Short mmCIF file of N, CA, C and O and ligand atoms in Angstrom, two decimals:
data_model
loop_
_atom_site.label_atom_id
_atom_site.label_comp_id
_atom_site.label_asym_id
_atom_site.label_seq_id
_atom_site.Cartn_x
_atom_site.Cartn_y
_atom_site.Cartn_z
N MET A 162 122.50 101.44 89.14
CA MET A 162 122.92 101.02 87.81
C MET A 162 122.01 99.92 87.28
O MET A 162 121.45 100.04 86.19
N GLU A 163 121.88 98.84 88.05
CA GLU A 163 121.04 97.72 87.65
C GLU A 163 119.59 97.94 88.09
O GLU A 163 119.29 98.86 88.84
N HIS A 164 118.70 97.08 87.61
CA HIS A 164 117.28 97.18 87.95
C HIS A 164 116.99 96.46 89.27
O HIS A 164 117.79 95.64 89.73
N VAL A 165 115.85 96.77 89.87
CA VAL A 165 115.45 96.15 91.13
C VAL A 165 114.91 94.75 90.91
O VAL A 165 114.34 94.45 89.86
N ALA A 166 115.09 93.89 91.91
CA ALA A 166 114.62 92.51 91.82
C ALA A 166 113.75 92.16 93.02
O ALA A 166 114.12 92.42 94.17
N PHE A 167 112.59 91.56 92.76
CA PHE A 167 111.67 91.17 93.82
C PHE A 167 112.24 90.01 94.63
O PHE A 167 112.69 89.01 94.08
N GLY A 168 112.21 90.15 95.95
CA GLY A 168 112.72 89.11 96.82
C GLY A 168 114.21 88.88 96.64
O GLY A 168 114.69 87.76 96.81
N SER A 169 114.93 89.94 96.29
CA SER A 169 116.37 89.85 96.08
C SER A 169 117.11 89.80 97.41
O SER A 169 116.56 90.15 98.46
N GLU A 170 118.37 89.36 97.37
CA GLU A 170 119.18 89.27 98.57
C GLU A 170 119.48 90.65 99.14
O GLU A 170 119.62 90.82 100.35
N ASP A 171 119.56 91.64 98.26
CA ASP A 171 119.84 93.01 98.67
C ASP A 171 118.71 93.95 98.24
O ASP A 171 118.96 95.09 97.84
N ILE A 172 117.48 93.46 98.31
CA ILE A 172 116.32 94.25 97.93
C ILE A 172 116.12 95.43 98.87
O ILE A 172 115.72 96.51 98.45
N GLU A 173 116.41 95.21 100.15
CA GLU A 173 116.27 96.26 101.15
C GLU A 173 117.40 97.28 101.05
O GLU A 173 117.19 98.48 101.19
N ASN A 174 118.61 96.78 100.80
CA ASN A 174 119.78 97.64 100.68
C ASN A 174 119.64 98.59 99.49
O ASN A 174 120.07 99.74 99.55
N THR A 175 119.03 98.09 98.42
CA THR A 175 118.83 98.90 97.22
C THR A 175 117.74 99.95 97.43
O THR A 175 117.95 101.13 97.17
N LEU A 176 116.59 99.51 97.91
CA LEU A 176 115.47 100.41 98.16
C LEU A 176 115.85 101.47 99.19
O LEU A 176 115.42 102.62 99.10
N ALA A 177 116.65 101.07 100.18
CA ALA A 177 117.09 101.99 101.22
C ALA A 177 117.74 103.23 100.62
O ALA A 177 117.57 104.34 101.13
N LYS A 178 118.49 103.03 99.54
CA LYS A 178 119.17 104.14 98.88
C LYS A 178 118.25 104.81 97.86
O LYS A 178 118.42 105.99 97.55
N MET A 179 117.29 104.05 97.35
CA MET A 179 116.35 104.57 96.37
C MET A 179 115.25 105.38 97.05
O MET A 179 114.95 105.17 98.23
N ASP A 180 114.65 106.31 96.31
CA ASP A 180 113.58 107.15 96.84
C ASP A 180 112.22 106.68 96.34
O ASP A 180 112.10 105.61 95.74
N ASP A 181 111.19 107.48 96.59
CA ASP A 181 109.84 107.15 96.17
C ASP A 181 109.74 107.13 94.64
O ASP A 181 109.01 106.32 94.07
N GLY A 182 110.46 108.04 94.00
CA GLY A 182 110.44 108.11 92.55
C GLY A 182 110.72 106.77 91.89
O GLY A 182 109.91 106.27 91.11
N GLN A 183 111.87 106.18 92.21
CA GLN A 183 112.25 104.89 91.65
C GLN A 183 111.30 103.79 92.12
O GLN A 183 110.96 102.89 91.35
N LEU A 184 110.89 103.87 93.38
CA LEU A 184 109.98 102.88 93.94
C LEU A 184 108.75 102.70 93.06
O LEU A 184 108.35 101.57 92.77
N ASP A 185 108.16 103.81 92.63
CA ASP A 185 106.98 103.77 91.77
C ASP A 185 107.32 103.14 90.42
O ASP A 185 106.45 102.56 89.77
N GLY A 186 108.57 103.27 90.01
CA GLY A 186 108.99 102.71 88.74
C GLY A 186 108.98 101.20 88.73
O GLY A 186 108.93 100.57 87.67
N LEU A 187 109.03 100.61 89.92
CA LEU A 187 109.03 99.15 90.05
C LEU A 187 107.81 98.55 89.37
O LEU A 187 106.76 99.19 89.25
N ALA A 188 107.95 97.31 88.91
CA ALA A 188 106.85 96.61 88.24
C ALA A 188 106.06 95.76 89.23
O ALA A 188 105.38 94.81 88.84
N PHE A 189 106.14 96.12 90.51
CA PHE A 189 105.42 95.39 91.55
C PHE A 189 104.92 96.33 92.63
O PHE A 189 105.08 97.55 92.53
N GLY A 190 104.30 95.77 93.66
CA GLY A 190 103.79 96.58 94.75
C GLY A 190 104.76 96.69 95.91
O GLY A 190 105.41 95.71 96.27
N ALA A 191 104.85 97.88 96.49
CA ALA A 191 105.75 98.11 97.62
C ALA A 191 105.09 98.98 98.68
O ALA A 191 104.60 100.07 98.39
N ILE A 192 105.08 98.49 99.92
CA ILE A 192 104.48 99.22 101.02
C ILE A 192 105.32 99.09 102.29
O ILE A 192 105.60 97.98 102.74
N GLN A 193 105.71 100.23 102.85
CA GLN A 193 106.51 100.24 104.07
C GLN A 193 105.65 100.52 105.29
O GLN A 193 104.95 101.54 105.35
N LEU A 194 105.70 99.62 106.26
CA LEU A 194 104.92 99.77 107.49
C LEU A 194 105.83 99.94 108.70
O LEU A 194 106.99 99.53 108.67
N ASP A 195 105.30 100.55 109.75
CA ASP A 195 106.06 100.77 110.97
C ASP A 195 105.82 99.65 111.98
O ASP A 195 105.13 98.68 111.68
N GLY A 196 106.39 99.80 113.17
CA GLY A 196 106.23 98.79 114.20
C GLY A 196 104.78 98.57 114.57
O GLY A 196 104.39 97.48 114.98
N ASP A 197 103.96 99.61 114.42
CA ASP A 197 102.54 99.53 114.74
C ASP A 197 101.74 99.08 113.52
O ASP A 197 100.60 98.63 113.65
N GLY A 198 102.34 99.22 112.34
CA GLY A 198 101.66 98.83 111.12
C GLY A 198 101.18 100.02 110.32
O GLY A 198 100.40 99.87 109.38
N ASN A 199 101.64 101.21 110.69
CA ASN A 199 101.25 102.43 110.00
C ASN A 199 101.94 102.53 108.64
O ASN A 199 103.13 102.24 108.51
N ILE A 200 101.18 102.93 107.63
CA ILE A 200 101.72 103.07 106.28
C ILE A 200 102.71 104.23 106.20
O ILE A 200 102.32 105.40 106.16
N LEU A 201 104.00 103.90 106.17
CA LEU A 201 105.05 104.90 106.09
C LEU A 201 105.35 105.26 104.64
O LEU A 201 105.62 106.42 104.32
N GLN A 202 105.31 104.26 103.77
CA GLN A 202 105.58 104.47 102.35
C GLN A 202 104.58 103.70 101.49
O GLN A 202 104.03 102.69 101.91
N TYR A 203 104.35 104.20 100.27
CA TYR A 203 103.42 103.56 99.35
C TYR A 203 103.76 103.90 97.91
O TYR A 203 103.60 105.04 97.47
N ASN A 204 104.24 102.91 97.16
CA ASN A 204 104.60 103.11 95.77
C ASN A 204 103.36 103.27 94.90
O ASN A 204 102.31 102.70 95.18
N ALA A 205 103.49 104.07 93.84
CA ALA A 205 102.38 104.31 92.93
C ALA A 205 101.89 103.00 92.30
O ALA A 205 100.69 102.79 92.14
N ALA A 206 102.83 102.14 91.94
CA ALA A 206 102.50 100.85 91.33
C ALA A 206 101.37 100.16 92.10
O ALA A 206 100.32 99.89 91.52
N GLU A 207 101.62 99.89 93.37
CA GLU A 207 100.62 99.22 94.20
C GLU A 207 99.35 100.07 94.27
O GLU A 207 98.23 99.56 94.20
N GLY A 208 99.55 101.37 94.42
CA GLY A 208 98.42 102.29 94.50
C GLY A 208 97.53 102.22 93.28
O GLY A 208 96.32 102.45 93.37
N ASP A 209 98.11 101.90 92.13
CA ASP A 209 97.36 101.80 90.89
C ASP A 209 96.59 100.49 90.82
O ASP A 209 95.39 100.47 90.54
N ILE A 210 97.29 99.39 91.08
CA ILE A 210 96.67 98.07 91.05
C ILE A 210 95.54 97.97 92.06
O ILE A 210 94.41 97.61 91.71
N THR A 211 95.84 98.29 93.31
CA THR A 211 94.84 98.23 94.38
C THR A 211 93.85 99.38 94.26
O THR A 211 92.66 99.21 94.50
N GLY A 212 94.35 100.56 93.88
CA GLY A 212 93.49 101.72 93.73
C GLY A 212 93.50 102.60 94.96
O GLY A 212 92.49 103.22 95.29
N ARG A 213 94.64 102.66 95.64
CA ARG A 213 94.77 103.48 96.84
C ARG A 213 95.81 104.57 96.64
O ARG A 213 96.74 104.43 95.85
N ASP A 214 95.65 105.67 97.37
CA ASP A 214 96.58 106.79 97.28
C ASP A 214 97.66 106.69 98.35
O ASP A 214 97.41 106.30 99.49
N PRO A 215 98.90 107.05 97.97
CA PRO A 215 100.05 107.01 98.88
C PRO A 215 99.96 108.08 99.97
O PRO A 215 100.07 107.78 101.16
N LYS A 216 99.77 109.32 99.55
CA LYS A 216 99.67 110.44 100.49
C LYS A 216 98.41 110.32 101.34
O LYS A 216 98.26 111.02 102.34
N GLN A 217 97.50 109.44 100.93
CA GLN A 217 96.25 109.24 101.65
C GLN A 217 96.39 108.12 102.67
O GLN A 217 95.74 108.14 103.72
N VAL A 218 97.24 107.14 102.37
CA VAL A 218 97.47 106.02 103.27
C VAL A 218 98.45 106.38 104.37
O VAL A 218 98.43 105.80 105.45
N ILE A 219 99.31 107.36 104.09
CA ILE A 219 100.30 107.80 105.06
C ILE A 219 99.67 108.03 106.43
O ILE A 219 98.76 108.84 106.58
N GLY A 220 100.16 107.30 107.43
CA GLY A 220 99.63 107.44 108.77
C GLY A 220 98.61 106.37 109.11
O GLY A 220 98.46 105.98 110.27
N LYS A 221 97.91 105.88 108.09
CA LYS A 221 96.90 104.85 108.28
C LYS A 221 97.53 103.46 108.27
O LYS A 221 98.46 103.20 107.51
N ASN A 222 97.01 102.58 109.12
CA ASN A 222 97.52 101.22 109.21
C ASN A 222 97.15 100.41 107.96
O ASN A 222 96.16 100.70 107.30
N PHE A 223 97.96 99.40 107.65
CA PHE A 223 97.72 98.56 106.49
C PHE A 223 96.44 97.74 106.67
O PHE A 223 95.76 97.41 105.70
N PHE A 224 96.11 97.42 107.92
CA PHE A 224 94.92 96.65 108.22
C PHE A 224 93.77 97.56 108.65
O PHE A 224 92.64 97.12 108.81
N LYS A 225 94.08 98.84 108.84
CA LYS A 225 93.08 99.82 109.25
C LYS A 225 92.17 100.19 108.09
O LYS A 225 90.95 100.03 108.16
N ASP A 226 92.77 100.67 107.00
CA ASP A 226 92.01 101.06 105.82
C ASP A 226 92.59 100.41 104.57
O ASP A 226 91.85 99.95 103.70
N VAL A 227 93.91 100.36 104.48
CA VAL A 227 94.59 99.76 103.34
C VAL A 227 94.07 98.35 103.08
O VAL A 227 94.08 97.87 101.94
N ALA A 228 93.62 97.69 104.14
CA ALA A 228 93.10 96.33 104.02
C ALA A 228 92.12 96.02 105.15
O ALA A 228 92.48 95.46 106.18
N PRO A 229 90.85 96.40 104.95
CA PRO A 229 89.79 96.17 105.94
C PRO A 229 89.43 94.70 106.07
O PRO A 229 89.02 94.06 105.11
N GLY A 230 89.59 94.17 107.28
CA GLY A 230 89.27 92.77 107.52
C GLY A 230 90.51 91.90 107.55
O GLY A 230 90.42 90.67 107.67
N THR A 231 91.68 92.52 107.43
CA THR A 231 92.94 91.79 107.44
C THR A 231 93.54 91.74 108.84
O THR A 231 94.74 91.56 109.00
N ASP A 232 92.69 91.90 109.85
CA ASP A 232 93.13 91.88 111.24
C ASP A 232 93.11 90.45 111.79
O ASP A 232 92.59 90.21 112.88
N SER A 233 93.67 89.52 111.02
CA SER A 233 93.71 88.12 111.43
C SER A 233 95.12 87.72 111.85
O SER A 233 96.10 88.39 111.56
N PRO A 234 95.22 86.58 112.57
CA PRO A 234 96.50 86.06 113.04
C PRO A 234 97.38 85.54 111.91
O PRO A 234 98.54 85.21 112.11
N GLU A 235 96.80 85.48 110.71
CA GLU A 235 97.53 85.00 109.54
C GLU A 235 98.28 86.14 108.86
O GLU A 235 99.39 85.96 108.35
N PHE A 236 97.67 87.32 108.85
CA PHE A 236 98.28 88.49 108.24
C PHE A 236 98.77 89.48 109.29
O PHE A 236 99.97 89.69 109.45
N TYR A 237 97.83 90.07 110.02
CA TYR A 237 98.16 91.04 111.06
C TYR A 237 99.00 90.39 112.15
O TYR A 237 100.00 90.96 112.60
N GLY A 238 98.61 89.19 112.57
CA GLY A 238 99.34 88.48 113.60
C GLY A 238 100.80 88.28 113.24
O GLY A 238 101.69 88.52 114.07
N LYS A 239 101.05 87.85 112.01
CA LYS A 239 102.42 87.62 111.55
C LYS A 239 103.22 88.92 111.55
O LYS A 239 104.39 88.93 111.92
N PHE A 240 102.58 90.00 111.14
CA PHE A 240 103.23 91.31 111.09
C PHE A 240 103.82 91.67 112.46
O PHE A 240 105.03 91.83 112.60
N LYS A 241 102.95 91.79 113.45
CA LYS A 241 103.38 92.13 114.81
C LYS A 241 104.24 91.02 115.40
O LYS A 241 105.16 91.29 116.17
N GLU A 242 103.93 89.78 115.04
CA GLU A 242 104.68 88.63 115.53
C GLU A 242 106.18 88.84 115.34
O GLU A 242 106.95 88.82 116.30
N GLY A 243 106.59 89.03 114.09
CA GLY A 243 108.00 89.23 113.80
C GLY A 243 108.56 90.47 114.47
O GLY A 243 109.69 90.47 114.94
N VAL A 244 107.76 91.53 114.51
CA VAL A 244 108.18 92.78 115.13
C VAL A 244 108.72 92.54 116.54
O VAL A 244 109.66 93.21 116.98
N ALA A 245 108.13 91.58 117.24
CA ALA A 245 108.55 91.25 118.60
C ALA A 245 109.93 90.60 118.60
O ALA A 245 110.72 90.81 119.51
N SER A 246 110.21 89.81 117.57
CA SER A 246 111.49 89.12 117.45
C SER A 246 112.56 90.07 116.92
O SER A 246 113.74 89.92 117.24
N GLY A 247 112.14 91.04 116.11
CA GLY A 247 113.08 91.99 115.55
C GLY A 247 113.53 91.60 114.15
O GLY A 247 114.67 91.88 113.76
N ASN A 248 112.65 90.95 113.40
CA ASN A 248 112.97 90.53 112.05
C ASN A 248 111.76 89.88 111.38
O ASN A 248 111.72 88.66 111.18
N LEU A 249 110.76 90.69 111.05
CA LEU A 249 109.55 90.20 110.41
C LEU A 249 109.86 89.61 109.03
O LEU A 249 109.93 90.33 108.04
N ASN A 250 110.04 88.30 108.99
CA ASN A 250 110.34 87.61 107.74
C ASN A 250 109.28 86.56 107.42
O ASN A 250 109.29 85.46 107.98
N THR A 251 108.36 86.90 106.53
CA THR A 251 107.29 85.99 106.14
C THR A 251 107.05 86.03 104.64
O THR A 251 107.11 87.09 104.02
N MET A 252 106.77 84.87 104.06
CA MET A 252 106.52 84.77 102.62
C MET A 252 105.39 83.79 102.33
O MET A 252 105.54 82.58 102.50
N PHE A 253 104.25 84.32 101.90
CA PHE A 253 103.09 83.50 101.60
C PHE A 253 102.16 84.21 100.61
O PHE A 253 102.35 85.38 100.30
N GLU A 254 101.16 83.48 100.12
CA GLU A 254 100.20 84.04 99.17
C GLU A 254 98.97 84.58 99.90
O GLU A 254 98.56 84.06 100.93
N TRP A 255 98.39 85.64 99.34
CA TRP A 255 97.20 86.25 99.93
C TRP A 255 96.15 86.53 98.87
O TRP A 255 96.46 86.66 97.69
N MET A 256 94.89 86.61 99.30
CA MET A 256 93.79 86.87 98.38
C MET A 256 93.34 88.33 98.46
O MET A 256 92.99 88.82 99.53
N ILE A 257 93.36 89.01 97.32
CA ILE A 257 92.96 90.41 97.27
C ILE A 257 91.61 90.57 96.58
O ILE A 257 91.52 90.71 95.36
N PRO A 258 90.53 90.55 97.37
CA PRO A 258 89.16 90.69 96.86
C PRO A 258 88.88 92.10 96.35
O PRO A 258 89.09 93.08 97.06
N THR A 259 88.40 92.19 95.11
CA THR A 259 88.09 93.48 94.51
C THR A 259 86.70 93.47 93.88
O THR A 259 85.94 92.52 94.05
N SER A 260 86.37 94.53 93.15
CA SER A 260 85.07 94.65 92.50
C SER A 260 84.96 93.67 91.33
O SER A 260 83.90 93.13 91.07
N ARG A 261 86.08 93.47 90.64
CA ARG A 261 86.11 92.56 89.50
C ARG A 261 86.16 91.11 89.96
O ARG A 261 85.89 90.19 89.18
N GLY A 262 86.51 90.90 91.22
CA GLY A 262 86.59 89.56 91.76
C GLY A 262 87.89 89.30 92.49
O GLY A 262 88.86 90.05 92.36
N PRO A 263 87.93 88.22 93.29
CA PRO A 263 89.12 87.85 94.06
C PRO A 263 90.25 87.35 93.17
O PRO A 263 90.02 86.69 92.15
N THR A 264 91.48 87.68 93.55
CA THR A 264 92.65 87.27 92.78
C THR A 264 93.83 86.95 93.70
O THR A 264 94.23 87.78 94.53
N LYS A 265 94.38 85.75 93.56
CA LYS A 265 95.51 85.33 94.38
C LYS A 265 96.77 86.10 94.00
O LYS A 265 96.98 86.43 92.84
N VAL A 266 97.61 86.37 95.00
CA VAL A 266 98.85 87.10 94.77
C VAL A 266 99.93 86.66 95.76
O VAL A 266 99.66 85.94 96.72
N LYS A 267 101.16 87.11 95.52
CA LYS A 267 102.28 86.77 96.39
C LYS A 267 102.57 87.90 97.38
O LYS A 267 102.63 89.07 96.99
N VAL A 268 102.73 87.55 98.65
CA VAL A 268 103.02 88.53 99.68
C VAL A 268 104.35 88.25 100.36
O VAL A 268 104.65 87.11 100.73
N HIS A 269 105.16 89.29 100.51
CA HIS A 269 106.47 89.16 101.15
C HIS A 269 106.76 90.34 102.06
O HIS A 269 106.81 91.49 101.61
N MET A 270 106.94 90.06 103.35
CA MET A 270 107.22 91.11 104.32
C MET A 270 108.58 90.89 104.97
O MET A 270 108.81 89.89 105.65
N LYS A 271 109.49 91.84 104.77
CA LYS A 271 110.83 91.76 105.33
C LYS A 271 111.18 93.04 106.09
O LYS A 271 111.12 94.13 105.53
N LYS A 272 111.56 92.88 107.35
CA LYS A 272 111.92 94.02 108.18
C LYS A 272 113.02 94.85 107.52
O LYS A 272 113.91 94.31 106.87
N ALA A 273 112.94 96.17 107.69
CA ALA A 273 113.93 97.07 107.11
C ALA A 273 115.32 96.81 107.67
O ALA A 273 115.49 95.97 108.56
N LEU A 274 116.31 97.53 107.16
CA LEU A 274 117.68 97.38 107.62
C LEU A 274 117.93 98.17 108.90
O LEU A 274 118.68 97.74 109.77
N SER A 275 117.28 99.33 109.00
CA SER A 275 117.43 100.19 110.17
C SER A 275 116.71 99.59 111.37
O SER A 275 117.05 99.88 112.52
N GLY A 276 115.72 98.75 111.10
CA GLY A 276 114.96 98.13 112.17
C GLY A 276 113.75 98.94 112.58
O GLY A 276 112.82 98.42 113.20
N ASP A 277 113.75 100.22 112.22
CA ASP A 277 112.64 101.10 112.55
C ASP A 277 111.64 101.19 111.39
O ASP A 277 111.07 102.24 111.13
N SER A 278 111.44 100.06 110.71
CA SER A 278 110.52 100.01 109.58
C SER A 278 110.47 98.60 108.99
O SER A 278 111.36 97.78 109.23
N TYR A 279 109.42 98.33 108.23
CA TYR A 279 109.25 97.02 107.60
C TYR A 279 108.83 97.16 106.14
O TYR A 279 108.03 98.03 105.80
N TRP A 280 109.38 96.31 105.29
CA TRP A 280 109.07 96.34 103.87
C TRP A 280 108.03 95.28 103.52
O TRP A 280 108.09 94.15 104.00
N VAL A 281 107.07 95.66 102.68
CA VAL A 281 106.01 94.74 102.27
C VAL A 281 105.79 94.81 100.76
O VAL A 281 105.19 95.76 100.25
N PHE A 282 106.26 93.79 100.05
CA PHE A 282 106.11 93.73 98.60
C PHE A 282 104.96 92.81 98.21
O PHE A 282 104.63 91.87 98.93
N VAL A 283 104.35 93.09 97.06
CA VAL A 283 103.24 92.28 96.57
C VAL A 283 103.31 92.11 95.05
O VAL A 283 103.38 93.09 94.31
N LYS A 284 103.28 90.86 94.60
CA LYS A 284 103.34 90.56 93.18
C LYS A 284 102.22 89.60 92.78
O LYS A 284 102.09 88.52 93.34
N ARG A 285 101.42 90.02 91.80
CA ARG A 285 100.31 89.20 91.32
C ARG A 285 100.82 87.88 90.74
O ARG A 285 101.73 87.87 89.91
N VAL A 286 100.22 86.78 91.18
CA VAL A 286 100.61 85.46 90.70
C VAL A 286 100.17 85.25 89.26
O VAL A 286 99.41 86.04 88.70
N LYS A 287 100.64 84.16 88.66
CA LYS A 287 100.30 83.84 87.28
C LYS A 287 98.85 83.38 87.17
O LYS A 287 98.26 82.91 88.15
N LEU A 288 98.27 83.50 85.98
CA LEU A 288 96.89 83.10 85.75
C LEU A 288 96.73 81.59 85.93
O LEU A 288 97.66 80.82 85.68
N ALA A 289 95.54 81.17 86.35
CA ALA A 289 95.26 79.76 86.56
C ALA A 289 93.80 79.54 86.95
O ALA A 289 93.17 80.41 87.54
N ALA A 290 93.27 78.37 86.60
CA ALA A 290 91.89 78.04 86.91
C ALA A 290 91.80 77.16 88.16
O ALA A 290 92.81 76.85 88.78
N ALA A 291 90.58 76.77 88.52
CA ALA A 291 90.36 75.93 89.69
C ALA A 291 88.95 75.36 89.70
O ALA A 291 88.08 75.83 88.96
N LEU A 292 88.73 74.36 90.54
CA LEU A 292 87.42 73.72 90.64
C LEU A 292 86.99 73.59 92.10
O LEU A 292 87.72 73.99 93.01
N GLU A 293 85.80 73.04 92.31
CA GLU A 293 85.27 72.86 93.66
C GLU A 293 85.58 71.46 94.18
O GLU A 293 85.63 70.50 93.42
N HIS A 294 85.80 71.36 95.49
CA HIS A 294 86.10 70.08 96.12
C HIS A 294 85.15 69.80 97.28
O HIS A 294 85.59 69.49 98.39
N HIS A 295 83.86 69.91 97.01
CA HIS A 295 82.84 69.67 98.04
C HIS A 295 82.25 68.27 97.90
O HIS A 295 82.10 67.75 96.79
N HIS A 296 81.92 67.66 99.03
CA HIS A 296 81.35 66.32 99.04
C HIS A 296 80.07 66.28 99.87
O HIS A 296 79.64 67.30 100.41
N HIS A 297 79.47 65.10 99.96
CA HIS A 297 78.24 64.92 100.73
C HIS A 297 78.49 65.13 102.22
O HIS A 297 79.54 64.77 102.74
N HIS A 298 77.51 65.73 102.90
CA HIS A 298 77.63 65.99 104.33
C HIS A 298 77.78 64.68 105.11
O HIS A 298 77.26 63.64 104.71
N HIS A 299 78.51 64.75 106.22
CA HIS A 299 78.74 63.57 107.05
C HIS A 299 78.50 63.90 108.52
O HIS A 299 78.95 63.15 109.38
C1 S1Q B 217 98.36 92.13 100.55
O1 S1Q B 217 97.06 92.58 100.60
C2 S1Q B 217 96.61 93.78 100.14
C3 S1Q B 217 97.48 94.71 99.53
C4 S1Q B 217 97.00 95.94 99.06
O2 S1Q B 217 97.83 96.83 98.49
C5 S1Q B 217 95.65 96.25 99.20
C6 S1Q B 217 94.77 95.34 99.79
C7 S1Q B 217 95.23 94.10 100.27
C8 S1Q B 217 94.32 93.09 100.92
C9 S1Q B 217 93.00 93.18 101.15
N1 S1Q B 217 92.14 94.26 100.83
C10 S1Q B 217 90.95 93.95 101.21
C11 S1Q B 217 89.84 94.93 100.99
C12 S1Q B 217 89.94 96.14 100.41
C13 S1Q B 217 88.80 97.08 100.21
C14 S1Q B 217 89.06 98.32 99.58
C15 S1Q B 217 88.02 99.23 99.38
N2 S1Q B 217 86.76 98.93 99.77
C16 S1Q B 217 86.47 97.75 100.38
C17 S1Q B 217 87.47 96.80 100.61
N3 S1Q B 217 90.90 92.66 101.82
C18 S1Q B 217 89.76 91.95 102.38
C19 S1Q B 217 92.16 92.18 101.78
O3 S1Q B 217 92.51 91.09 102.21
#
């Protein structure tokens, strides 16, 4: 009846009942990974922004092709980290380097309700500028 909300208290409960059709309707990115990190689900929204295909990512790991070079303890490490505890709950910002240039965004990974899957949402942050903070060598 109501619309979906990013980082909602019942975001998983809602999506669990919703299918791929509605998922793509979302105004944000949604990616479901398995215990190993294999792309189980992929909403069109994210596929459009990033430029990746859902039926093409299916089976492939998020750090395998979906994100080459993301095999760090900050991203990949956290993913498997929570999996060991049985509740991958992490919320931080990530940099998505593209052809047009790097752009900061919001990343949220919450383990599914069934436990045999993990939800990964992504929302582009607001526009903003920045400067350099370099000093003389010491
Ligand atoms: C939450 O993070 C993401 C969500 C997504 O949906 C897609 C991507 C990323 C993150 C990253 N993607 C890349 C590189 C992609 C690439 C694609 C095609 N050719 C060369 C490189 N790097 C370095 C990332 O950190």
